[PDB]
């Protein structure tokens, strides 16, 4: 199988969430 | 429109019932054309760069997805109608609050501001969250006048999982669309002979993206 995190769009991990 | 009505009677049963919903003619002819000046002058200063994916490997990042891109908060001058687009997003997620599947919604990414320049740009077939990253809804609006994709293309087809169908999607102007981020929803974007807009918007599931971030801050 693939590693479908390969295809995955970037986002940010840590630092950069936005709170509702 | 009312949020609390077409979140309520509309999204929440159509994404539940479906993965996918369809907003056409969210925000207007004005305020889309607005948003749609602000993205093309990010463009013409040079803030977009080539998209990335989360995991980077031997291959060109170029031979998965075609489009560029820049983030935005909302508040940076020149940007404020994109602001308000995130802000009526948000405005729709908030009303959603406990009625989209099981998860609980407390934040999004910033905006993804993406452009594909034409020339058979885009994405091959993916996932968007297939590793628990914590992103459980994906909301897009699209901001192009006058795209005819019989000849531009730029369909983003989704193959929604347990469905005799798929579901084409055409980059439509001031159309908005959800859809669940996770292994429900696979995609692609079809290529782009003309320039092509959209801005992108994930959000989070709480718990999911609580334990996403753990793994993040110990070394995965
Ligand atoms: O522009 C679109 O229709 C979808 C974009 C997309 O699939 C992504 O960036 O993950
Ligand atoms: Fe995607």
Redesign the pocket.
Known sequence: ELDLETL??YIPMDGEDFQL | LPALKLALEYIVPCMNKHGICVVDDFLGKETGQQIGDEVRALHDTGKFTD?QLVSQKSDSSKDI?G?KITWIEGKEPGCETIGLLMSSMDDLIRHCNGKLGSYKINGRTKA?V?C?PGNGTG?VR?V?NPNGDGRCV?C?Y?LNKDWDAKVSGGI?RIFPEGKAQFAD?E?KFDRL?FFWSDRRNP???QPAYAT?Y?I?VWYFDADERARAKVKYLTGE
Do not use: K, S
Request: negative net charge; hydrophobic residues 40%.
């Open positions: 995955a769009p | 998209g997805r489009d993804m993406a594909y994405y993916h968007d994906t897009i699209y983003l999607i980059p669309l995609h692609e974007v092509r959209a992108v």
